[PDB]
Protein backbone atom coordinates (compact mmCIF):
# COMPACT_ATOMS: atom_id res chain seq x y z
CA UNK A 1 0.00 0.00 0.00
CA UNK A 2 0.95 3.61 -0.80
CA UNK A 3 2.13 6.58 1.23
CA UNK A 4 -0.69 8.64 2.82
CA UNK A 5 0.69 11.81 1.16
CA UNK A 6 -1.18 10.76 -2.01
CA UNK A 7 -4.25 12.07 -0.23
CA UNK A 8 -2.78 15.55 -0.53
CA UNK A 9 -1.22 14.91 -3.94
CA UNK A 10 -4.53 13.81 -5.40
CA UNK A 11 -6.78 16.48 -3.84
CA UNK A 12 -4.47 19.20 -5.16
CA UNK A 13 -4.80 17.61 -8.60
CA UNK A 14 -8.59 17.72 -8.41
CA UNK A 15 -8.80 21.27 -6.99
CA UNK A 16 -6.30 22.37 -9.64
CA UNK A 17 -8.50 20.58 -12.17
CA UNK A 18 -11.75 22.25 -11.10
CA UNK A 19 -10.12 25.68 -11.40
CA UNK A 20 -9.00 24.95 -14.97
CA UNK A 21 -12.58 23.98 -15.80
CA UNK A 22 -13.80 27.12 -14.02
CA UNK A 23 -11.30 29.32 -15.84
CA UNK A 24 -12.42 27.99 -19.23
CA UNK A 25 -16.05 28.46 -18.20
CA UNK A 26 -15.53 32.13 -17.34
CA UNK A 27 -13.37 32.71 -20.44
CA UNK A 28 -16.21 31.36 -22.59
CA UNK A 29 -18.87 33.26 -20.61
CA UNK A 30 -16.89 36.51 -20.92
CA UNK A 31 -16.56 35.94 -24.66
CA UNK A 32 -20.29 35.28 -25.02
CA UNK A 33 -21.31 38.27 -22.89
CA UNK A 34 -18.99 40.84 -24.41
CA UNK A 35 -19.96 39.91 -27.97
CA UNK A 36 -23.66 40.02 -27.03
CA UNK A 37 -23.22 43.51 -25.50
CA UNK A 38 -21.27 44.66 -28.59
CA UNK A 39 -24.01 43.67 -31.03
CA UNK A 40 -25.84 46.95 -31.60
CA UNK A 41 -28.73 45.36 -33.52
CA UNK A 42 -30.46 44.37 -30.26
CA UNK A 43 -31.90 46.30 -27.36
CA UNK A 44 -29.53 45.80 -24.42
CA UNK A 45 -29.84 42.42 -22.71
CA UNK A 46 -26.63 42.95 -20.74
CA UNK A 47 -24.81 45.91 -19.18
CA UNK A 48 -21.13 46.68 -19.08
CA UNK A 49 -20.92 46.05 -15.31
CA UNK A 50 -21.77 42.40 -15.94
CA UNK A 51 -19.17 42.10 -18.69
CA UNK A 52 -16.49 43.75 -16.54
CA UNK A 53 -17.50 41.80 -13.41
CA UNK A 54 -16.94 38.61 -15.42
CA UNK A 55 -13.64 39.84 -16.89
CA UNK A 56 -12.61 40.55 -13.31
CA UNK A 57 -13.63 37.03 -12.30
CA UNK A 58 -11.52 35.73 -15.16
CA UNK A 59 -8.43 37.56 -13.83
CA UNK A 60 -9.08 36.56 -10.21
CA UNK A 61 -9.58 32.89 -11.13
CA UNK A 62 -6.35 32.92 -13.08
CA UNK A 63 -4.71 34.49 -10.02
CA UNK A 64 -5.89 31.70 -7.72
CA UNK A 65 -4.65 29.17 -10.27
CA UNK A 66 -1.06 30.31 -9.68
CA UNK A 67 -1.27 30.06 -5.88
CA UNK A 68 -3.17 26.72 -5.78
CA UNK A 69 -0.77 24.87 -8.04
CA UNK A 70 1.97 25.81 -5.52
CA UNK A 71 0.25 24.70 -2.31
CA UNK A 72 2.41 22.26 -0.39
CA UNK A 73 2.40 20.59 3.02
CA UNK A 74 4.67 21.95 5.76
CA UNK A 75 6.14 20.25 8.87
CA UNK A 76 8.34 22.17 11.32
CA UNK A 77 10.70 20.60 13.86
CA UNK A 78 11.64 22.32 17.12
CA UNK A 79 13.72 21.60 20.14
CA UNK A 80 17.21 21.43 21.54
CA UNK A 81 19.95 20.86 18.95
CA UNK A 82 21.57 18.11 21.02
CA UNK A 83 18.35 15.99 21.04
CA UNK A 84 18.70 15.10 17.35
CA UNK A 85 16.25 17.47 15.69
CA UNK A 86 18.54 17.39 12.64
CA UNK A 87 19.08 13.62 12.38
CA UNK A 88 15.32 13.07 12.46
CA UNK A 89 14.89 15.06 9.22
CA UNK A 90 17.88 13.24 7.75
CA UNK A 91 16.22 9.91 8.64
CA UNK A 92 12.99 10.92 6.81
CA UNK A 93 14.94 12.01 3.70
CA UNK A 94 17.17 8.88 3.88
CA UNK A 95 20.29 11.03 3.72
CA UNK A 96 22.59 13.38 5.56
CA UNK A 97 20.82 16.44 4.15
CA UNK A 98 21.33 18.93 6.98
CA UNK A 99 24.66 19.73 8.65
CA UNK A 100 24.85 17.75 11.84
CA UNK A 101 27.38 16.63 14.40
CA UNK A 102 29.55 19.66 15.08
CA UNK A 103 25.04 23.21 12.59
CA UNK A 104 24.11 26.90 12.10
CA UNK A 105 21.67 29.06 14.06
CA UNK A 106 18.94 29.95 11.57
CA UNK A 107 15.79 28.47 10.02
CA UNK A 108 16.29 25.76 7.38
CA UNK A 109 13.69 24.82 4.79
CA UNK A 110 13.88 21.56 2.84
CA UNK A 111 11.95 21.46 -0.43
CA UNK A 112 12.36 19.36 -3.55
CA UNK A 113 13.39 20.25 -7.08
CA UNK A 114 13.18 18.44 -10.42
CA UNK A 115 16.85 19.17 -11.08
CA UNK A 116 19.17 16.38 -10.06
CA UNK A 117 21.62 18.23 -7.80
CA UNK A 118 21.28 20.52 -4.82
CA UNK A 119 21.45 24.26 -4.19
CA UNK A 120 20.94 26.97 -1.52
CA UNK A 121 18.71 30.04 -1.48
CA UNK A 122 18.45 33.11 0.74
CA UNK A 123 20.90 33.59 -6.43
CA UNK A 124 21.65 29.81 -6.48
CA UNK A 125 24.58 28.67 -4.27
CA UNK A 126 25.79 25.07 -4.83
CA UNK A 127 25.91 22.41 -2.07
CA UNK A 128 26.95 19.03 -3.57
CA UNK A 129 28.07 17.45 -0.25
CA UNK A 130 26.97 17.93 3.36
CA UNK A 131 30.43 19.27 4.24
CA UNK A 132 29.99 21.76 1.41
CA UNK A 133 26.62 22.79 2.88
CA UNK A 134 28.08 23.36 6.35
CA UNK A 135 30.74 25.74 4.96
CA UNK A 136 28.52 27.85 2.68
CA UNK A 137 26.60 28.52 5.89
CA UNK A 138 29.90 28.93 7.74
CA UNK A 139 31.39 31.54 5.38
CA UNK A 140 28.29 33.78 5.16
CA UNK A 141 28.65 36.09 8.18
CA UNK A 142 25.53 38.00 7.06
CA UNK A 143 22.96 35.27 7.89
CA UNK A 144 21.28 35.11 11.29
CA UNK A 145 18.68 33.23 13.31
CA UNK A 146 15.89 35.32 11.85
CA UNK A 147 16.96 34.64 8.29
CA UNK A 148 15.53 31.74 6.31
CA UNK A 149 17.66 29.47 4.10
CA UNK A 150 16.12 26.93 1.71
CA UNK A 151 17.81 23.65 0.81
CA UNK A 152 16.43 22.79 -2.66
CA UNK A 153 16.96 18.97 -2.74
CA UNK A 154 16.50 16.54 -5.64
CA UNK A 155 13.07 14.97 -5.33
CA UNK A 156 14.01 11.89 -7.36
CA UNK A 157 16.03 10.99 -4.25
CA UNK A 158 13.19 11.27 -1.72
CA UNK A 159 9.49 10.45 -2.34
CA UNK A 160 8.41 12.79 0.49
CA UNK A 161 9.60 15.76 -1.58
CA UNK A 162 7.94 14.58 -4.82
CA UNK A 163 4.64 14.50 -2.93
CA UNK A 164 4.88 18.28 -2.14
CA UNK A 165 6.21 18.05 1.40
CA UNK A 166 8.38 20.80 2.86
CA UNK A 167 10.57 20.19 5.93
CA UNK A 168 11.63 23.14 8.08
CA UNK A 169 14.37 22.98 10.70
CA UNK A 170 14.15 25.59 13.41
CA UNK A 171 17.15 26.91 15.35
CA UNK A 172 18.11 24.99 18.47
CA UNK A 173 16.10 26.11 21.47
CA UNK A 174 18.00 27.35 24.53
CA UNK A 175 16.79 28.87 27.78
CA UNK A 176 16.71 32.57 26.80
CA UNK A 177 16.20 32.00 23.07
CA UNK A 178 13.45 34.35 21.90
CA UNK A 179 10.86 32.13 20.18
CA UNK A 180 8.40 34.97 20.19
CA UNK A 181 8.89 36.07 16.58
CA UNK A 182 9.10 32.47 15.34
CA UNK A 183 5.43 31.60 14.82
CA UNK A 184 4.33 34.75 12.97
CA UNK A 185 7.41 34.96 10.73
CA UNK A 186 7.70 31.28 9.73
CA UNK A 187 5.20 28.76 11.17
CA UNK A 188 1.82 30.31 10.38
CA UNK A 189 1.49 28.09 7.29
CA UNK A 190 2.78 24.94 9.06
CA UNK A 191 0.42 21.94 9.29
CA UNK A 192 2.23 19.80 11.89
CA UNK A 193 4.72 20.72 14.62
CA UNK A 194 7.35 18.22 15.82
CA UNK A 195 8.97 18.63 19.23
CA UNK A 196 12.13 16.50 19.21
CA UNK A 197 13.15 15.93 22.84
CA UNK A 198 15.03 13.39 24.98
CA UNK A 199 13.15 10.56 26.66
CA UNK A 200 14.82 10.67 30.06
CA UNK A 201 14.82 14.44 30.70
CA UNK A 202 11.80 16.66 31.31
CA UNK A 203 10.84 19.18 28.63
CA UNK A 204 12.37 22.64 28.87
CA UNK A 205 9.95 25.36 29.94
CA UNK A 206 10.91 27.36 26.84
CA UNK A 207 9.95 24.34 24.74
CA UNK A 208 6.57 24.20 26.51
CA UNK A 209 5.95 27.93 26.07
CA UNK A 210 6.55 27.82 22.33
CA UNK A 211 4.06 24.98 21.87
CA UNK A 212 1.45 26.67 24.05
CA UNK A 213 1.71 29.80 21.89
CA UNK A 214 1.14 27.54 18.88
CA UNK A 215 -1.87 26.01 20.66
CA UNK A 216 -3.45 29.44 21.30
CA UNK A 217 -2.66 31.08 17.96
CA UNK A 218 -3.31 28.23 15.50
CA UNK A 219 -6.47 26.31 14.64
CA UNK A 220 -5.91 22.73 15.90
CA UNK A 221 -2.17 22.41 15.41
CA UNK A 222 -1.11 18.81 15.03
CA UNK A 223 1.62 18.31 17.61
CA UNK A 224 3.84 15.25 17.65
CA UNK A 225 6.30 14.53 20.45
CA UNK A 226 9.45 12.69 19.36
CA UNK A 227 11.50 11.28 22.19
CA UNK A 228 14.89 10.64 20.60
CA UNK A 229 18.13 9.17 22.12
CA UNK A 230 16.37 5.89 22.94
CA UNK A 231 19.10 3.38 21.96
CA UNK A 232 20.38 3.54 25.58
CA UNK A 233 17.59 0.97 26.27
CA UNK A 234 19.59 -1.66 24.38
CA UNK A 235 21.67 -2.32 27.52
CA UNK A 236 19.16 -1.38 30.27
CA UNK A 237 15.91 -2.74 28.82
CA UNK A 238 14.34 -3.31 32.24
CA UNK A 239 14.85 0.28 33.43
CA UNK A 240 13.83 1.95 30.15
CA UNK A 241 10.51 0.07 30.25
CA UNK A 242 9.76 1.85 33.54
CA UNK A 243 10.98 5.15 32.09
CA UNK A 244 9.00 4.90 28.87
CA UNK A 245 5.72 4.47 30.70
CA UNK A 246 6.53 7.42 32.96
CA UNK A 247 7.44 9.78 30.14
CA UNK A 248 4.51 8.55 28.06
CA UNK A 249 2.30 9.65 30.94
CA UNK A 250 4.08 13.01 31.00
CA UNK A 251 3.75 13.86 27.31
CA UNK A 252 0.11 12.73 27.21
CA UNK A 253 -0.83 14.99 30.12
CA UNK A 254 0.94 17.80 28.31
CA UNK A 255 -0.84 17.08 25.03
CA UNK A 256 -4.28 16.21 26.42
CA UNK A 257 -4.55 18.39 29.53
CA UNK A 258 -1.92 21.14 29.42
CA UNK A 259 -2.44 21.88 25.68
CA UNK A 260 -5.70 20.18 24.69
CA UNK A 261 -4.61 19.26 21.15
CA UNK A 262 -5.50 15.52 21.33
CA UNK A 263 -7.73 13.55 23.65
CA UNK A 264 -6.34 10.51 25.48
CA UNK A 265 -7.42 8.03 22.79
CA UNK A 266 -5.26 9.53 20.03
CA UNK A 267 -2.32 10.41 22.33
CA UNK A 268 -0.43 7.25 21.40
CA UNK A 269 -0.46 8.22 17.73
CA UNK A 270 1.30 11.44 18.65
CA UNK A 271 4.08 10.36 21.08
CA UNK A 272 6.98 8.18 19.93
CA UNK A 273 10.23 6.81 21.34
CA UNK A 274 12.94 6.31 18.72
CA UNK A 275 16.67 6.62 17.83
CA UNK A 276 17.13 8.73 14.69
CA UNK A 277 20.88 7.97 14.69
CA UNK A 278 20.12 4.27 14.27
CA UNK A 279 17.38 4.85 11.69
CA UNK A 280 19.69 7.20 9.76
CA UNK A 281 22.68 4.84 9.66
CA UNK A 282 20.52 1.89 8.65
CA UNK A 283 18.89 3.72 5.73
CA UNK A 284 22.28 5.04 4.59
CA UNK A 285 23.51 1.44 4.61
CA UNK A 286 20.46 0.13 2.74
CA UNK A 287 20.68 2.38 -0.33
CA UNK A 288 24.40 1.67 -0.85
CA UNK A 289 24.46 -1.91 0.43
CA UNK A 290 22.36 -3.97 18.72
CA UNK A 291 19.49 -5.49 20.73
CA UNK A 292 15.93 -4.24 20.48
CA UNK A 293 16.86 -3.00 17.02
CA UNK A 294 13.83 -4.07 14.97
CA UNK A 295 11.35 -2.92 17.62
CA UNK A 296 12.88 0.58 17.63
CA UNK A 297 13.31 0.49 13.84
CA UNK A 298 9.60 -0.35 13.53
CA UNK A 299 8.53 2.50 15.81
CA UNK A 300 10.19 5.05 13.53
CA UNK A 301 8.50 3.66 10.44
CA UNK A 302 5.21 3.65 12.36
CA UNK A 303 5.75 7.27 13.43
CA UNK A 304 6.56 8.20 9.82
CA UNK A 305 3.24 6.67 8.75
CA UNK A 306 1.24 8.21 11.56
CA UNK A 307 2.69 11.59 10.63
CA UNK A 308 1.98 11.31 6.88
CA UNK A 309 -1.66 10.43 7.58
CA UNK A 310 -2.06 13.45 9.85
CA UNK A 311 -0.30 15.99 7.61
CA UNK A 312 -2.08 14.91 4.41
CA UNK A 313 -5.55 15.05 5.97
CA UNK A 314 -4.97 18.35 7.77
CA UNK A 315 -3.10 20.14 5.00
CA UNK A 316 -5.85 19.57 2.42
CA UNK A 317 -8.49 21.01 4.76
CA UNK A 318 -6.33 24.05 5.56
CA UNK A 319 -4.80 25.06 2.18
CA UNK A 320 -7.92 24.61 0.03
CA UNK A 321 -10.97 25.42 2.22
CA UNK A 322 -11.08 29.13 1.37
CA UNK A 323 -10.23 28.62 -2.31
CA UNK A 324 -13.12 26.17 -2.68
CA UNK A 325 -15.54 28.63 -1.06
CA UNK A 326 -14.26 31.38 -3.36
CA UNK A 327 -14.81 29.26 -6.50
CA UNK A 328 -18.33 28.37 -5.37
CA UNK A 329 -19.20 32.02 -4.88
CA UNK A 330 -17.64 33.05 -8.21
CA UNK A 331 -19.62 30.34 -10.00
CA UNK A 332 -22.77 31.68 -8.33
CA UNK A 333 -22.18 35.23 -9.61
CA UNK A 334 -21.57 34.11 -13.20
CA UNK A 335 -24.62 31.86 -12.94
CA UNK A 336 -26.89 34.80 -11.97
CA UNK A 337 -25.55 36.99 -14.80
CA UNK A 338 -26.45 34.34 -17.36
CA UNK A 339 -29.74 33.80 -15.59
CA UNK A 340 -30.48 37.53 -15.78
CA UNK A 341 -29.50 37.56 -19.45
CA UNK A 342 -31.60 34.50 -20.28
CA UNK A 343 -34.69 36.23 -18.83
CA UNK A 344 -34.06 39.59 -20.48
CA UNK A 345 -33.60 37.98 -23.89
CA UNK A 346 -36.90 36.19 -23.28
CA UNK A 347 -38.66 39.41 -22.29
CA UNK A 348 -37.45 41.19 -25.43
CA UNK A 349 -38.47 38.28 -27.67
CA UNK A 350 -42.00 38.71 -26.38
CA UNK A 351 -41.84 42.42 -27.26
CA UNK A 352 -40.72 41.69 -30.82
CA UNK A 353 -43.42 39.09 -31.35
CA UNK A 354 -46.15 41.61 -30.52
CA UNK A 355 -44.49 44.12 -32.87
CA UNK A 356 -44.64 41.40 -35.53
CA UNK A 357 -48.34 40.87 -34.76
CA UNK A 358 -48.84 44.63 -35.03
CA UNK A 359 -46.94 44.94 -38.30
CA UNK A 360 -49.28 42.40 -39.92
CA UNK A 361 -52.19 44.76 -39.02
CA UNK A 362 -50.74 47.57 -41.17
CA UNK A 363 -50.04 48.33 -44.82
CA UNK A 364 -49.02 45.68 -47.34
CA UNK A 365 -46.07 47.34 -49.12
CA UNK A 366 -42.84 45.76 -47.79
CA UNK A 367 -44.72 43.52 -45.35
CA UNK A 368 -42.49 40.52 -45.96
CA UNK A 369 -39.31 42.59 -46.21
CA UNK A 370 -40.31 44.02 -42.83
CA UNK A 371 -41.42 40.68 -41.33
CA UNK A 372 -38.13 39.05 -42.38
CA UNK A 373 -36.15 41.61 -40.38
CA UNK A 374 -38.31 41.01 -37.32
CA UNK A 375 -38.16 37.22 -37.82
CA UNK A 376 -34.36 37.49 -38.10
CA UNK A 377 -34.18 39.46 -34.84
CA UNK A 378 -36.51 37.03 -33.04
CA UNK A 379 -34.22 34.16 -34.02
CA UNK A 380 -31.13 35.83 -32.51
CA UNK A 381 -32.92 36.43 -29.21
CA UNK A 382 -34.13 32.81 -29.18
CA UNK A 383 -30.58 31.61 -29.87
CA UNK A 384 -29.30 33.90 -27.08
CA UNK A 385 -31.71 32.26 -24.65
CA UNK A 386 -30.20 28.95 -25.73
CA UNK A 387 -26.57 29.79 -25.10
CA UNK A 388 -27.38 31.62 -21.87
CA UNK A 389 -29.42 28.70 -20.51
CA UNK A 390 -26.52 26.38 -21.41
CA UNK A 391 -24.07 28.69 -19.64
CA UNK A 392 -26.34 28.75 -16.58
CA UNK A 393 -26.61 24.98 -16.34
CA UNK A 394 -22.87 24.23 -16.50
CA UNK A 395 -22.24 26.71 -13.71
CA UNK A 396 -24.38 24.32 -11.71
CA UNK A 397 -22.05 21.51 -12.74
CA UNK A 398 -19.11 23.44 -11.28
CA UNK A 399 -21.24 23.96 -8.19
CA UNK A 400 -22.00 20.24 -8.08
CA UNK A 401 -18.31 19.43 -8.66
CA UNK A 402 -16.97 21.73 -5.91
CA UNK A 403 -19.57 20.50 -3.41
CA UNK A 404 -18.32 16.98 -4.04
CA UNK A 405 -14.80 18.18 -3.16
CA UNK A 406 -15.98 19.73 0.13
CA UNK A 407 -17.67 16.43 1.07
CA UNK A 408 -14.60 14.28 0.26
CA UNK A 409 -11.69 16.49 1.48
CA UNK A 410 -13.10 19.24 3.72
CA UNK A 411 -15.17 17.35 6.26
CA UNK A 412 -14.24 18.34 9.85
CA UNK A 413 -12.73 14.93 10.87
Author numbering: 25 to 126, 129 to 148, 153 to 319, 328 to 400, 706 to 756
What does the publication say?
Outer mitochondrial membrane (OMM) fusion is catalyzed by the dynamin-like GTPase called mitofusin (MFN). We generated a modified human MFN2 construct with deletions of residues 1–21 and 401–705 (MFN2IM). MFN2IM contains a G domain and a helical domain 1 (HD1). In this study, we address these issues by presenting crystal structures of truncated human MFN2 in different stages of the GTP turnover cycle. These structures explain how MFN2 uses a primate-only single amino acid variance and a tighter G interface, as compared with human MFN1, to allow for enduring GTPase (G) domain association even after GTP hydrolysis, a feature that is unique in the dynamin superfamily and ensures efficient membrane tethering.
We determined crystal structures of MFN2IM in the nucleotide-free and GDP-bound forms at 2.8 and 2.0 Å, respectively. Unlike MFN1, MFN2IM has a disordered switch I in the nucleotide-free state, and the Trp260 does not occupy the nucleotide-binding pocket. MFN2IM showed much higher affinity to GTPγS and GDP compared with MFN1IM, and could efficiently bind to GMPPNP. The stronger nucleotide association of MFN2IM may be partly explained by the aforementioned conformational variance to MFN1IM: the disordered switch I and outwardly oriented Trp260 leave an empty pocket that facilitates nucleotide docking. The cluster is apparently disfavored by the Thr129 exchange in MFN2, which endows the observed flexibility to switch I in the nucleotide-free state. Intriguingly, we observed calcium ions (Ca2+) associated with the HD1 of both nucleotide-free wild-type MFN2IM and MFN2IM(T111D), and one of them is involved in intermolecular contact. HD1 is connected to the G domain via the so-called hinge 2, namely Arg95 at the C-terminal end of α2H, and Lys357 between α5G and α3H. The four-helical-bundle HD1 is stabilized by a massive hydrophobic network. ɑ4H, which comprises large portion of the conventional HR2, is substantially involved in this network. The C-terminal tip of ɑ4H physically contacts the G domain. In our crystal structures, however, Met376 is surrounded by Phe56, Leu57, and Leu734 from the neighboring helices, and separated from Leu727.
